[PDB]
Amino acid sequence: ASPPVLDLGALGQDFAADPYPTYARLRAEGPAHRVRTPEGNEVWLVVGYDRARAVLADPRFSKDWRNSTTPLTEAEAALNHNMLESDPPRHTRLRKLVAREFTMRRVELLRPRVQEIVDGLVDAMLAAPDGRADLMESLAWPLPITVISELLGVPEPDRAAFRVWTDAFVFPDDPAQAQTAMAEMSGYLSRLIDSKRGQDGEDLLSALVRTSDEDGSRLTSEELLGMAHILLVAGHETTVNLIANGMYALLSHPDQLAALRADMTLLDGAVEEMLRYEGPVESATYRFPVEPVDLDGTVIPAGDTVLVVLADAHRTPERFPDPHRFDIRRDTAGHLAFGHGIHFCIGAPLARLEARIAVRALLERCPDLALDVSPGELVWYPNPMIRGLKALPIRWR
Numbered sequence: 468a469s470p471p472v473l474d475l476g477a478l479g480q481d482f483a484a485d486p487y488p489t490y491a492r493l494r495a496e497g498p499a500h501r502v503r504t505p506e507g508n509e510v511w512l513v514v515g516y517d518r519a520r521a522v523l524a525d526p527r528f529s530k531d532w533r534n535s536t537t538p539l540t541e542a543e544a545a546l547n548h549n550m551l552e553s554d555p556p557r558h559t560r561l562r563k564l565v566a567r568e569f570t571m572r573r574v575e576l577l578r579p580r581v582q583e584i585v586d587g588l589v590d591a592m593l594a595a596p597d598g599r600a601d602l603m604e605s606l607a608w609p610l611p612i613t614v615i616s617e618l619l620g621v622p623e624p625d626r627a628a629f630r631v632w633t634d635a636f637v638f639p640d641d642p643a644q645a646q647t648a649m650a651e652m653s654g655y656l657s658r659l660i661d662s663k664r665g666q667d668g669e670d671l672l673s674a675l676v677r678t679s680d681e682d683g684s685r686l687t688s689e690e691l692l693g694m695a696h697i698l699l700v701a702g703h704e705t706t707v708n709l710i711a712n713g714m715y716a717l718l719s720h721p722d723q724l725a726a727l728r729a730d731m732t733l734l735d736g737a738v739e740e741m742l743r744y745e746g747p748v749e750s751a752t753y754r755f756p757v758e759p760v761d762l763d764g765t766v767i768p769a770g771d772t773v774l775v776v777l778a779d780a781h782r783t784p785e786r787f788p789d790p791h792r793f794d795i796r797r798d799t800a801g802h803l804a805f806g807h808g809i810h811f812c813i814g815a816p817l818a819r820l821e822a823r824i825a826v827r828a829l830l831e832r833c834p835d836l837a838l839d840v841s842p843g844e845l846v847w848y849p850n851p852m853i854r855g856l857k858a859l860p861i862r863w864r
């Protein structure tokens with residue numbers, strides 16, 4: 468098994484909008500399958516819950532490009548010295564540098580500010596005299612970029628460029644465009660990092676700049692750039708699309724929206740079912756077997772690129788009964804939306820804070836909130852890694 472069984476690019480927007488039957492037909496055949504992604508990368512998909520969960524945490528599957536037979540491009544090579552693209556001991560050292568910033572209790576201190584951002588965004592949206600807006604434009608995009616920029620020290624005029632870059636690397640026009648985006652962002656971050664030195668800033672990037680300048684063995688200039696990149700990007704498309712994907716799931720399932728409105732203590736469980744049913748990470752980041760790995764008789768060679776397909780894990784009926792049902796009351800324990808094992812999402816407390824506030828705000832403030840679009844007018848991103856919409860037209864009384 469070297470040739471792909473499927474080119475997901477060829478499957479078009481049908482597969483972007485509703486990839487589940489594809490993954491499930493694969494799962495019926497076996498746990499691992501060669502495919503060519505839309506962007507043109509030949510990779511393995513790992514499907515099925517138990518196998519997904521095990522591969523995510525299995526140290527046989529490195530995240531370090533030194534273990535990949537595909538080389539990094541020059542633009543990619545400027546950015547790979549980050550925790551998500553490292554194994555221990557580098558992963559361990561890098562994540563210790565920021566772990567305290569992202570604990571549930573540290574992130575709790577942002578609640579007043581996150582609440583204020585949401586309320587301001589929601590007030591402005593609610594001023595449309597026709598009671599129609601795009602939820603993606605009004606709320607889901609600007610909330611997470613505001614929060615993460617304040618933390619990191621990205622000046623407000625520089626924030627809109629990240630929507631552009633981050634879209635380019637999710638859904639590029641062509642392979643060139645993703646590579647150009649990366650180089651542009653990378654250049655920008657290097658300049659931003661530079662502009663911090665000697666400036667006595669108190670944001671997280673300023674603190675990391677001093678840490679690296681005081682001792683480059685603790686945080687190298689390449690690691691300094693990779694940390695800035697990963698904290699910005701890793702949390703970005705994900706949080707934005709959690710908010711919009713989840714509100715889409717709630718609004719397209721009126722019984723569940725009604726349940727939640729009648730019992731707002733259902734809120735945490737609802738956001739967990741958003742993650743399970745409509746989470747933004749469709750497939751996890753690249754893994755590379757350090758030696759050939761046998762998965763029930765399918766052998767993945769050492770060095771090949773492996774996607775763990777979280778979306779299909781989440782539709783495995785042995786683990787999530789009646790898996791196509793969006794049920795805010797469901798037991799979502801064991802979902803893989805934030806990963807599992809040493810790379811488990813460091814942003815999860817922050818992501819949950821943002822999405823819980825946002826969902827509750829929309830619900831309490833937008834009476835008769837509803838979709839303003841037939842489900843088939845929506846357009847989805849093709850990338851097998853990220854599940855995401857272009858727009859989300861909504862309406863309220």
Ligand code: HEM
Pocket residue numbers: 523550551552562615697698701702703705706709746747748751752753803804805806807809810811812813814815817818819
């Ligand atoms: C709902 C929104 C979010 C989702 C669904 C999400 C999901 C994920 C997933 C699946 C992983 C592991 C990837 C893999 O194992 O291949 C991950 C790791 C990571 N996440 Fe998130 N994340 C979100 C929000 C955030 C935010 C807000 C931040 C930053 C403040 C963030 C920062 C990171 C970082 C730095 C890693 C790498 C951690 C490591 O390698 O140890 N994420 N996330």
Ligand SMILES: CC[C@H]1OC(=O)[C@H](C)[C@@H](OC(=O)CCN(C)C)[C@@H](C)C[C@@H](C)C(=O)/C=C/[C@H]1C
Pocket residue numbers: 539543544546547551552636637697700701702704705748750751752850852853
């Ligand atoms: C899970 C977090 C997030 O993924 C990431 O942040 C990826 C690490 C990140 O990819 C890279 O930075 C790769 C750089 N090396 C090639 C050098 C991200 C931009 C991938 C992209 C498809 C995405 O938005 C994917 C976003 C999510 C899947």
